[PDB]
């Protein structure tokens with residue numbers, strides 16, 4: 001099931017990076033940087049632009065990205081992709 | 089990039105089934121049934137289907153649009169995430 | 175070991191897989207072009223698009239107006255798709 | 265699976281893999297062009313003079329770099345070449 | 355091609371891959387059990403687990419209290435995990 | 445990924461692939477157990493011999509094989525394999 | 531492992547896959563040759579006359595069939611063509 | 620799609636992978652020939668063969684005697700190997 | 713994992729894939745041997761042999777003359793094939 | 806494609822991958838045989854036990870293992886495996 005495996009990849013990827021330092025279940029600036037760089041290179045197409053992104057994702061303003069904020073982020077990307085299918 | 093491919097699969101799967109009948113960009117009961125059966129067998133009679141169709145269709149237009157589809161997938165991801173909390 | 179050279183191969187070979195089916199072996203007629211787009215570029219068209227949208231496409235690609243799509247017209251068409259993809263990166 | 269749609273992906277992605285290394289992130293300098301040809305199009309390619317002759321041909325707007333549009337023309341040119349094979353070399 | 359027969363093979367072979375490293379060749383000491391869980395069952399332990407939780411586990415598996423994990427104890431442990439997984443289906 | 449984690453997955457999923465076909469969705473009847481053994485464990489495996497096995501596995505004597513009895517069975521096979529290494 | 535050794539294997543085996551169908555097991559008749567060209571070398575080649583011209587060219591000992599040797603020459607000849615691409619004319 | 624077309628491609632490409640390393644870019648010198656044989660045809664050469672056996676081989680393939688193996692001489696060599704392989708199907712009469 | 717251990721697996725498993733089809737579950741009758749050779753060793757038989765060449769072979773493999781090929785007779789056969797292969801490595805003397 | 810023919814290929818090739826290392830290129834000396842067994846048949850091998858094995862295989866007693874003696878050895882392992890099916 002590509003779809004079930006896709007969910008697996010989404011969930012597992014978060015934890016591959018979140019558990020590196022500090023809170024094991026939350027992405028700090030550094031870990032977020034790794035994940036985006038290694039896992040979503042197409043999206044990231046500089047430190048200031050990173051900060052603007054980190055700010056956007058961290059909606060509860062605790063300086064880190066939890067799984068929930070991570071899902072919202074991925075949905076956002078999905079949202080973009082979907083625009084292609086409706087035919088701009 | 090597994091993750092970028094994962095997003096691709098999520099978005100593409102929706103349209104593989106939504107465009108079969110009626111509104112090309114929305115899942116009717118029949119299309120949703122196919123997608124769940126063929127694509128999410130681990131998650132899944134007719135009553136339980138109706139309860140699901142009802143839950144996902146938050147704007148109550150009798151069909152599942154992409155946005156409602158995303159919420160549904162987030163929900164599943166949410167459950168998977170619980171496992172990782174030890 | 176060369177995705178790009180393989181990609182060119184796929185681009186060139188795909189044309190001839192469909193063009194040589196009927197009529198002129200080196201040109202795509204409305205029917206052959208319909209097959210290629212449907213089977214090979216489903217993301218560009220999408221299902222059951224009304225014959226009118228096909229005609230508008232067929233018209234746009236056939237720049238020398240001979241009612242068929244030759245390899246040169248086919249490349250322009252692919253370039254055009256590439257161009258669109260490139261906007262994503264830009 | 266769509267070999268053709270993946271082929272287009274490879275064509276566009278390969279450009280950016282090399283163009284974003286130095287300088288203008290959306291254009292290929294002599295150096296980046298040299299990597300791309302060497303690693304991605306070995307079949308097509310070597311002294312520095314032949315490279316210069318090539319860089320010169322590709323850079324039609326004469327800004328010393330190869331933009332995506334110039335790149336597409338280049339790839340089409342290769343495809344053109346390939347196409348001659350299918351027509352028995354007329 | 356029998357996934358299930360291969361799966362049984364993997365279960366039996368993985369044990370011996372780690373048990374035969376030191377001491378009793380047919381039993382897992384604290385160190386050998388640490389490797390197996392870290393390398394082979396990362397989802398169960400979650401990376402970099404501290405020493406106390408390890409000890410609590412080593413204690414739970416070693417039902418005959420000989421300070422090591424024999425194949426039989428190992429199977430119970432895997433059954434346990436399988437039980438866990440099974441809950442998801444019901 | 446992890447051969448061993450995948451191996452547990454296959455063990456658990458295989459059971460359900462056959463248990464949910466008829467009757468109790470979480471138990472293997474004689475018929476379902478026949479399928480699983482035949483298609484999935486051909487090396488291990490005559491109606492009488494089948495009855496003798498069905499009898500051995502069904503330790504709580506409810507005429508079917510639940511997941512717990514299943515794992516004991518697989519453990520038994522593992523046990524056999526282990527003897528080779530010794 | 532060894533693409534090249536595998537390539538020699540494919541060359542040799544493919545011949546036999548078709549030669550053994552009818553008549554002499556170790557030679558290609560017009561029909562078996564037509565199959566091999568159509569299914570195995572579609573880029574090289576359909577109308578009858580051009581087939582005859584080919585069968586004529588390959589069958590250098592003129593026994594109406596294509597033996598393995600006459601096959602090797604044919605394949606070498608194709609390789610020669612391909613080589614011209616590298617040998618930048 | 621076509622094992623046989625791919626086979627010819629590998630045949631032609633492998634030549635050039637080794638011939639363009641040094642000297643004439645379109646011919647195999649003793650050294651390039653030894654690489655190709657060793658890395659691409661290990662079954663033919665077997666292993667740890669003597670500089671003399673190599674010389675005998677280099678000598679056999681270099682029909683026009685210019686001390687290098689060209690594409691044409693290379694085709695003859697592979698045909699030759701092909702011939703041997705063919706004997707197996709012919710049951711080694 | 714280990715090509716060689718997997719090879720032995722394939723050798724033993726294949727025998728039983730065909731022997732257990734009819735009659736004695738642990739021996740190969742004319743018919744089951746015909747399937748095995750055709751489906752599993754096509755290179756050895758070549759293509760569509762006459763029934764007579766099959767009989768000559770069945771005869772050769774069945775050393776104990778019980779009209780069937782047991783696992784031991786099977787091994788001898790496979791070793792025989794290996795022997796042949798080995799001649800290739802030994803310069804074909 | 807043919808597992809069985811590939812299996813014969815592996816059997817024959819493996820021998821020569823080790824025999825041609827030192828001395829007679831077409832025979833296995835004690836050292837070469839040790840390598841082959843260690844690296845290729847780890848499941849079989851439980852200095853003295855090695856000597857007992859070397860002695861058993863070397864039926865013509867020339868202090869090395871030739872291909873024919875190698876086939877006998879492999880057949881022997883096959884016999885062993887066959888007992889399982891029987």
Ligand SMILES: CN1CCN(CCCN2c3ccccc3Sc3ccc(Cl)cc32)CC1
Nearest residue numbers: 004007008011130131164168171442453457
């Ligand atoms: C076919 N085999 C593949 C694995 N599957 C496991 C089902 C649960 N599993 C999951 C559980 C714990 C952590 C991550 C995941 S990944 C996932 C994603 C979506 C769903 Cl509905 C279920 C899961 C199904 C059984």
Ligand SMILES: CN1CCN(CCCN2c3ccccc3Sc3ccc(Cl)cc32)CC1
Nearest residue numbers: 042043077081084092095096099262273277
């Ligand atoms: C390596 N090649 C892989 C394909 N890439 C496509 C980029 C756009 N694309 C997307 C667009 C429309 C529908 C589905 C998708 S799929 C996707 C997923 C994630 C992102 Cl950030 C972007 C996309 C470009 C890079």
Ligand SMILES: CN1CCN(CCCN2c3ccccc3Sc3ccc(Cl)cc32)CC1
Nearest residue numbers: 179182183186307308342346349615628632
């Ligand atoms: C490894 N082997 C792969 C095949 N190669 C073919 C060379 C020419 N070949 C081509 C010719 C005619 C039709 C399609 C193609 S496909 C292609 C794509 C790009 C280029 Cl530069 C050259 C080609 C040569 C190197």
Ligand SMILES: CN1CCN(CCCN2c3ccccc3Sc3ccc(Cl)cc32)CC1
Nearest residue numbers: 084096100217218255259262269272273276
């Ligand atoms: C099957 N999955 C593969 C990804 N697809 C994404 C659709 C757009 N996408 C594209 C966009 C941006 C950069 C590269 C590409 S690659 C491409 C090639 C051809 C077309 Cl018509 C569309 C695209 C469609 C869905």
Ligand SMILES: CN1CCN(CCCN2c3ccccc3Sc3ccc(Cl)cc32)CC1
Nearest residue numbers: 359362363366487488525526528721725889
């Ligand atoms: C299909 N190939 C797979 C391997 N088979 C060999 C039979 C024994 N083999 C086993 C023996 C010793 C250690 C681990 C295993 S693994 C296994 C699992 C289940 C069973 Cl019934 C039998 C085995 C049959 C042949």
Ligand SMILES: CN1CCN(CCCN2c3ccccc3Sc3ccc(Cl)cc32)CC1
Nearest residue numbers: 008012171397398435439442449452453456
């Ligand atoms: C990358 N993905 C691979 C699969 N991972 C398994 C996560 C939970 N999952 C499981 C859950 C429900 C049914 C079957 C299984 S299979 C399994 C085996 C062992 C363990 Cl500790 C956990 C599981 C999660 C990480």
Ligand SMILES: CN1CCN(CCCN2c3ccccc3Sc3ccc(Cl)cc32)CC1
Nearest residue numbers: 535538539542662663700704707800814818
């Ligand atoms: C890994 N294994 C692959 C197979 N090998 C077989 C050696 C002989 N074998 C051959 C014999 C009869 C028909 C086809 C072929 S295929 C081939 C190609 C090139 C050469 Cl030198 C030798 C052969 C030995 C090495």
Ligand SMILES: CN1CCN(CCCN2c3ccccc3Sc3ccc(Cl)cc32)CC1
Nearest residue numbers: 183187349573574612613615624627628631
């Ligand atoms: C599917 N795509 C694969 C690549 N194809 C290339 C066709 C020409 N090409 C060739 C040309 C120059 C060097 C090597 C080769 S490889 C080859 C082998 C046999 C033949 Cl008839 C033609 C060729 C076209 C069909």
Ligand SMILES: CN1CCN(CCCN2c3ccccc3Sc3ccc(Cl)cc32)CC1
Nearest residue numbers: 308342345346348349353611612614615616
């Ligand atoms: C004058 N001219 C016009 C276009 N042609 C020139 C080079 C073709 N040449 C090639 C050479 C040998 C065999 C097959 C090919 S087909 C090919 C494909 C791609 C490239 Cl970059 C170059 C080639 C053929 C004749």
Ligand SMILES: CN1CCN(CCCN2c3ccccc3Sc3ccc(Cl)cc32)CC1
Nearest residue numbers: 662663664665700703704707800801803804
């Ligand atoms: C270790 N080395 C020693 C030299 N040996 C060459 C003899 C094998 N012989 C053959 C004879 C003459 C020219 C080329 C070949 S290559 C070949 C391919 C297939 C077959 Cl069945 C038999 C052969 C190959 C094995």
Ligand SMILES: CN1CCN(CCCN2c3ccccc3Sc3ccc(Cl)cc32)CC1
Nearest residue numbers: 539543707755756793797800810813814817
């Ligand atoms: C498709 N291609 C696969 C390779 N084939 C080679 C046939 C001869 N070849 C052999 C000869 C010398 C050394 C190793 C081997 S490997 C082998 C195994 C079984 C048999 Cl009957 C024959 C062989 C021919 C058919």
Ligand SMILES: CN1CCN(CCCN2c3ccccc3Sc3ccc(Cl)cc32)CC1
Nearest residue numbers: 363367713717720721724848849886887889
């Ligand atoms: C990873 N897993 C691979 C399979 N392993 C099985 C061990 C015994 N197994 C065997 C047993 C019974 C019948 C056929 C076979 S197949 C085989 C071949 C050679 C040897 Cl030494 C051992 C075996 C155990 C290790």
Ligand SMILES: [Ca+2]
Nearest residue numbers: 018019020021
């Ligand atoms: Ca962390």
Ligand SMILES: [Ca+2]
Nearest residue numbers: 058062064065
């Ligand atoms: Ca936060």
Ligand SMILES: [Ca+2]
Nearest residue numbers: 106109110111
């Ligand atoms: Ca619809």
Ligand SMILES: [Ca+2]
Nearest residue numbers: 147149151153
């Ligand atoms: Ca709705």
